[PDB]
Amino acid sequence: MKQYLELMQKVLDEGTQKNDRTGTGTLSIFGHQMRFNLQDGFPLVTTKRCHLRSIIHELLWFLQGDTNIAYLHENNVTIWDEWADENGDLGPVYGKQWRAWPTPDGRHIDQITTVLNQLKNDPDSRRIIVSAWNVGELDKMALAPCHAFFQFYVADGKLSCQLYQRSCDVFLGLPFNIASYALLVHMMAQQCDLEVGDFVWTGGDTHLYSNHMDQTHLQLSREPRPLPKLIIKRKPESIFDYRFEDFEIEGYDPHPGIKAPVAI
Amino acid sequence: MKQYLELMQKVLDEGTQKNDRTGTGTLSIFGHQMRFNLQDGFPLVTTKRCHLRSIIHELLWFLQGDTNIAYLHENNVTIWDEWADENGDLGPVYGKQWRAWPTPDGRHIDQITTVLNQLKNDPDSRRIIVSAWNVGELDKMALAPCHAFFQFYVADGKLSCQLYQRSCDVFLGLPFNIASYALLVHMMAQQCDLEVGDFVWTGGDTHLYSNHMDQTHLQLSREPRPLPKLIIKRKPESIFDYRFEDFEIEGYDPHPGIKAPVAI
Ligand SMILES: *C1=[C@@]2(F[C]2N2[C]([C][N]C3=[C][C]=C(C(=O)[N][C]([C][C]C([O])=O)C([O])=O)[C]=[C]3)[C][N]C3=C2C(=O)[N]C([N])=N3)C(=O)[N]C(=O)N1[C]1[C][C]([O])[C]([C]OP([O])([O])=O)O1
Ligand SMILES: *C1=[C@@]2(F[C]2N2[C]([C][N]C3=[C][C]=C(C(=O)[N][C]([C][C]C([O])=O)C([O])=O)[C]=[C]3)[C][N]C3=C2C(=O)[N]C([N])=N3)C(=O)[N]C(=O)N1[C]1[C][C]([O])[C]([C]OP([O])([O])=O)O1
């Protein structure tokens, strides 16, 4: 998509060489922001084929409050396999944090429910936020949250969401984080009788792994096609009730996929 | 500063009318990002004289993990007066979450110490963060962190910082926020022998309260001046050792101050 492709070119033009945890080495920039008007089309990358199945399944898994890959397996999604223990566990990652952030006083807060309630009774609130960034549990997580905190906003009968992504693998993670947050907005928007507004993505260390440079230049040589269109076929009783099947992406015609290795 | 006045103009030209919590009404935009090269001078508004002493103590108050305005008082700093209790407590706000995030099990994690250790031992790290957004203790705070979450980055011996500000008062709060974090980059940069890099500011709900329309217009017509320069007179032995006397500004020739009511 135009915005995505401009971020890539930005990394290349202004990125500095950095060593990283995975010992692979990156090209990184610090602080970026791009806006996607969800009414223009569904933000699914077209200059490379993306695997929607994996995208959706992962989010349904987040919303369930699950942190074990079994679910992901039953559905043939193996994007998290490498961080998973012998038992399929990832520790208190996203889904636990979103649905049951543990408080110091033996309580547990469901952040999605909270947000949902806020978008309905006090949408002018400047406190409509979900944080995966739970400092008391980071040491028990397979990996610390990449997409760590988000905030909603309603104005003119449109829901907007802004994401603060602390670390971003531009080639592999980014296309995934974008289509995912966008589908979240559409889902929230349906539950609250809002129209879709903007998805604004903000980044922390945004980088290209040193082993994704050729694939990067290949992609860039491609011209984006018209964005797909999301069609939700049902209105479940709760946000927690979507099924893989309620969702339909129309008009998706991307360039051929490009393989690249994930740094572990 | 040019970045600042442009944002002030943007709220006016595009903000949508919102009924806020204070009941004042505000002009609002969702999502904005500005960057400040700390190398080019300290980001202290010059189109209105800023109260540097309030900015400094507030900060030093934070680093101590103090949640009591007592200390703010002794230094004749009244900015947190209206939200404190009869005892002068605000609850586990900023100071408490920076210096002692209460874990579920009874421990406490010192996020500041952690960040120092990370900058000294693992600068390339992508998890260098401090969060004041402790979901479990939000109901205990007088008000929720406006400056929620921030993250440090190191590239080429330079230390950069990025702040996620969920709610922002362009007129009163903003200038205070920008110079407060800048000041921090500076004390961080020095205790860790790095050069200063960029200060990236990202906001959620960014607004101008409707009773600041005048002051805003008054301010929108002055020519920004050159930015001052920060001098750290001494190298304390630890970052919890700064003092007011240690900081000096130079070349701060501001336009005259502007008085404005605070929305409570
Ligand atoms: C981070 C995050 F959280 C991500 N991630 C994870 C996992 N996930 C995934 C994986 C893989 C993939 C793929 O491969 N894709 C492909 C295929 C599809 C199918 O097959 O289905 C395409 O697309 O083509 C996907 C997904 C964990 N880990 C990791 C990740 C990434 O991404 N990368 C890496 N290297 N690793 C998010 O969300 N995002 C992002 O971006 N991230 C990242 C950032 C960095 O780089 C990392 C982390 O680390 P630190 O250190 O920073 O912490 O990652
Ligand atoms: C939020 C925050 F946390 C701010 N803030 C606070 C306090 N601080 C302050 C106050 C006041 C001031 C003034 O006035 N200043 C002046 C003077 C100085 C002397 O005198 O000393 C000038 O500057 O001139 C300052 C400071 C708390 N509260 C509040 C505040 C503000 O600002 N505003 C209001 N209204 N209140 C931060 O940090 N930031 C921000 O921005 N904030 C804000 C945002 C909003 O608006 C609010 C909150 O609400 P929600 O709903 O969102 O939560 O705030």
PDB file of N, CA, C and O in Angstrom, chain B residues 144-174:
ATOM      1  N   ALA B 144      -5.631   9.934  35.684  1.00  0.00           N
ATOM      2  CA  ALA B 144      -4.832   8.918  34.991  1.00  0.00           C
ATOM      3  C   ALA B 144      -3.666   9.575  34.297  1.00  0.00           C
ATOM      4  O   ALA B 144      -3.899  10.703  33.838  1.00  0.00           O
ATOM      5  N   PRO B 145      -2.540   8.890  34.182  1.00  0.00           N
ATOM      6  CA  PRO B 145      -1.377   9.483  33.542  1.00  0.00           C
ATOM      7  C   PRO B 145      -1.785  10.117  32.226  1.00  0.00           C
ATOM      8  O   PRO B 145      -2.507   9.537  31.410  1.00  0.00           O
ATOM      9  N   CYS B 146      -1.372  11.338  31.939  1.00  0.00           N
ATOM     10  CA  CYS B 146      -1.600  11.977  30.626  1.00  0.00           C
ATOM     11  C   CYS B 146      -0.420  11.530  29.746  1.00  0.00           C
ATOM     12  O   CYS B 146      -0.553  11.195  28.567  1.00  0.00           O
ATOM     13  N   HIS B 147       0.727  11.497  30.394  1.00  0.00           N
ATOM     14  CA  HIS B 147       2.002  11.032  29.802  1.00  0.00           C
ATOM     15  C   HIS B 147       2.110   9.601  30.354  1.00  0.00           C
ATOM     16  O   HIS B 147       2.526   9.379  31.499  1.00  0.00           O
ATOM     17  N   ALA B 148       1.694   8.676  29.484  1.00  0.00           N
ATOM     18  CA  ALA B 148       1.488   7.304  29.838  1.00  0.00           C
ATOM     19  C   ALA B 148       2.654   6.362  29.826  1.00  0.00           C
ATOM     20  O   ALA B 148       2.918   5.647  30.803  1.00  0.00           O
ATOM     21  N   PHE B 149       3.253   6.436  28.681  1.00  0.00           N
ATOM     22  CA  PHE B 149       4.236   5.495  28.239  1.00  0.00           C
ATOM     23  C   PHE B 149       5.342   6.175  27.426  1.00  0.00           C
ATOM     24  O   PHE B 149       5.063   6.990  26.539  1.00  0.00           O
ATOM     25  N   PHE B 150       6.595   5.833  27.731  1.00  0.00           N
ATOM     26  CA  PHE B 150       7.739   6.363  26.950  1.00  0.00           C
ATOM     27  C   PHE B 150       8.838   5.362  26.811  1.00  0.00           C
ATOM     28  O   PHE B 150       8.960   4.448  27.643  1.00  0.00           O
ATOM     29  N   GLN B 151       9.576   5.501  25.723  1.00  0.00           N
ATOM     30  CA  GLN B 151      10.588   4.522  25.331  1.00  0.00           C
ATOM     31  C   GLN B 151      11.865   5.185  24.801  1.00  0.00           C
ATOM     32  O   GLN B 151      11.810   6.115  23.984  1.00  0.00           O
ATOM     33  N   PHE B 152      12.979   4.647  25.279  1.00  0.00           N
ATOM     34  CA  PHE B 152      14.324   5.117  24.909  1.00  0.00           C
ATOM     35  C   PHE B 152      14.903   4.214  23.815  1.00  0.00           C
ATOM     36  O   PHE B 152      14.573   3.027  23.716  1.00  0.00           O
ATOM     37  N   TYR B 153      15.755   4.821  23.039  1.00  0.00           N
ATOM     38  CA  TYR B 153      16.428   4.200  21.890  1.00  0.00           C
ATOM     39  C   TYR B 153      17.845   4.792  21.894  1.00  0.00           C
ATOM     40  O   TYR B 153      17.967   5.935  22.386  1.00  0.00           O
ATOM     41  N   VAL B 154      18.845   4.053  21.477  1.00  0.00           N
ATOM     42  CA  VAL B 154      20.215   4.452  21.341  1.00  0.00           C
ATOM     43  C   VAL B 154      20.641   4.030  19.920  1.00  0.00           C
ATOM     44  O   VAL B 154      20.399   2.880  19.527  1.00  0.00           O
ATOM     45  N   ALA B 155      21.216   4.977  19.223  1.00  0.00           N
ATOM     46  CA  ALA B 155      21.725   4.739  17.856  1.00  0.00           C
ATOM     47  C   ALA B 155      22.917   5.694  17.695  1.00  0.00           C
ATOM     48  O   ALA B 155      22.720   6.900  17.910  1.00  0.00           O
ATOM     49  N   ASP B 156      24.078   5.150  17.390  1.00  0.00           N
ATOM     50  CA  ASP B 156      25.324   5.893  17.179  1.00  0.00           C
ATOM     51  C   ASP B 156      25.731   6.751  18.366  1.00  0.00           C
ATOM     52  O   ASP B 156      25.972   7.967  18.147  1.00  0.00           O
ATOM     53  N   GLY B 157      25.765   6.228  19.575  1.00  0.00           N
ATOM     54  CA  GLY B 157      26.098   6.965  20.785  1.00  0.00           C
ATOM     55  C   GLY B 157      25.174   8.093  21.185  1.00  0.00           C
ATOM     56  O   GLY B 157      25.498   8.881  22.114  1.00  0.00           O
ATOM     57  N   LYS B 158      24.018   8.191  20.563  1.00  0.00           N
ATOM     58  CA  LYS B 158      22.958   9.169  20.850  1.00  0.00           C
ATOM     59  C   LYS B 158      21.772   8.456  21.507  1.00  0.00           C
ATOM     60  O   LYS B 158      21.415   7.338  21.097  1.00  0.00           O
ATOM     61  N   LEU B 159      21.177   9.101  22.479  1.00  0.00           N
ATOM     62  CA  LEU B 159      19.993   8.615  23.193  1.00  0.00           C
ATOM     63  C   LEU B 159      18.761   9.402  22.763  1.00  0.00           C
ATOM     64  O   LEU B 159      18.791  10.602  23.063  1.00  0.00           O
ATOM     65  N   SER B 160      17.759   8.810  22.228  1.00  0.00           N
ATOM     66  CA  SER B 160      16.487   9.340  21.818  1.00  0.00           C
ATOM     67  C   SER B 160      15.425   8.811  22.765  1.00  0.00           C
ATOM     68  O   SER B 160      15.669   7.864  23.489  1.00  0.00           O
ATOM     69  N   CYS B 161      14.285   9.477  22.766  1.00  0.00           N
ATOM     70  CA  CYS B 161      13.122   9.186  23.595  1.00  0.00           C
ATOM     71  C   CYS B 161      11.845   9.513  22.840  1.00  0.00           C
ATOM     72  O   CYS B 161      11.816  10.482  22.084  1.00  0.00           O
ATOM     73  N   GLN B 162      10.850   8.683  23.044  1.00  0.00           N
ATOM     74  CA  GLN B 162       9.554   8.780  22.425  1.00  0.00           C
ATOM     75  C   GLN B 162       8.504   8.608  23.503  1.00  0.00           C
ATOM     76  O   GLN B 162       8.588   7.574  24.190  1.00  0.00           O
ATOM     77  N   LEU B 163       7.580   9.530  23.550  1.00  0.00           N
ATOM     78  CA  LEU B 163       6.479   9.581  24.478  1.00  0.00           C
ATOM     79  C   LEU B 163       5.125   9.514  23.762  1.00  0.00           C
ATOM     80  O   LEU B 163       4.717  10.192  22.791  1.00  0.00           O
ATOM     81  N   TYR B 164       4.341   8.631  24.351  1.00  0.00           N
ATOM     82  CA  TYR B 164       2.960   8.423  24.038  1.00  0.00           C
ATOM     83  C   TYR B 164       2.146   9.197  25.109  1.00  0.00           C
ATOM     84  O   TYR B 164       2.111   8.762  26.286  1.00  0.00           O
ATOM     85  N   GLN B 165       1.542  10.285  24.663  1.00  0.00           N
ATOM     86  CA  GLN B 165       0.676  11.109  25.545  1.00  0.00           C
ATOM     87  C   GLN B 165      -0.769  10.884  25.094  1.00  0.00           C
ATOM     88  O   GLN B 165      -1.167  11.287  23.952  1.00  0.00           O
ATOM     89  N   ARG B 166      -1.507  10.186  25.944  1.00  0.00           N
ATOM     90  CA  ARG B 166      -2.881   9.832  25.588  1.00  0.00           C
ATOM     91  C   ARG B 166      -3.793  11.031  25.560  1.00  0.00           C
ATOM     92  O   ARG B 166      -4.666  11.099  24.668  1.00  0.00           O
ATOM     93  N   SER B 167      -3.658  11.909  26.514  1.00  0.00           N
ATOM     94  CA  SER B 167      -4.512  13.130  26.585  1.00  0.00           C
ATOM     95  C   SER B 167      -3.585  14.341  26.696  1.00  0.00           C
ATOM     96  O   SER B 167      -2.569  14.340  27.438  1.00  0.00           O
ATOM     97  N   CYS B 168      -3.928  15.361  25.935  1.00  0.00           N
ATOM     98  CA  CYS B 168      -3.102  16.569  25.904  1.00  0.00           C
ATOM     99  C   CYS B 168      -3.768  17.910  25.747  1.00  0.00           C
ATOM    100  O   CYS B 168      -4.492  18.312  24.800  1.00  0.00           O
ATOM    101  N   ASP B 169      -3.475  18.763  26.715  1.00  0.00           N
ATOM    102  CA  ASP B 169      -3.912  20.168  26.794  1.00  0.00           C
ATOM    103  C   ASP B 169      -2.836  20.944  26.007  1.00  0.00           C
ATOM    104  O   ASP B 169      -1.759  21.203  26.613  1.00  0.00           O
ATOM    105  N   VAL B 170      -3.138  21.280  24.736  1.00  0.00           N
ATOM    106  CA  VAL B 170      -2.111  21.987  23.940  1.00  0.00           C
ATOM    107  C   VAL B 170      -1.587  23.224  24.648  1.00  0.00           C
ATOM    108  O   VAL B 170      -0.370  23.404  24.708  1.00  0.00           O
ATOM    109  N   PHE B 171      -2.462  24.057  25.220  1.00  0.00           N
ATOM    110  CA  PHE B 171      -2.138  25.303  25.862  1.00  0.00           C
ATOM    111  C   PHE B 171      -1.390  25.228  27.127  1.00  0.00           C
ATOM    112  O   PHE B 171      -0.292  25.836  27.170  1.00  0.00           O
ATOM    113  N   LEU B 172      -1.835  24.626  28.181  1.00  0.00           N
ATOM    114  CA  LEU B 172      -1.212  24.540  29.475  1.00  0.00           C
ATOM    115  C   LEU B 172      -0.196  23.433  29.656  1.00  0.00           C
ATOM    116  O   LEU B 172       0.958  23.713  30.001  1.00  0.00           O
ATOM    117  N   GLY B 173      -0.623  22.220  29.424  1.00  0.00           N
ATOM    118  CA  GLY B 173       0.173  21.025  29.535  1.00  0.00           C
ATOM    119  C   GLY B 173       1.260  20.716  28.598  1.00  0.00           C
ATOM    120  O   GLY B 173       2.310  20.303  29.105  1.00  0.00           O
ATOM    121  N   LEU B 174       1.090  20.849  27.328  1.00  0.00           N
ATOM    122  CA  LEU B 174       2.023  20.541  26.290  1.00  0.00           C
ATOM    123  C   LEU B 174       3.399  21.094  26.431  1.00  0.00           C
ATOM    124  O   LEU B 174       4.307  20.258  26.364  1.00  0.00           O
TER     125      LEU B 174
END
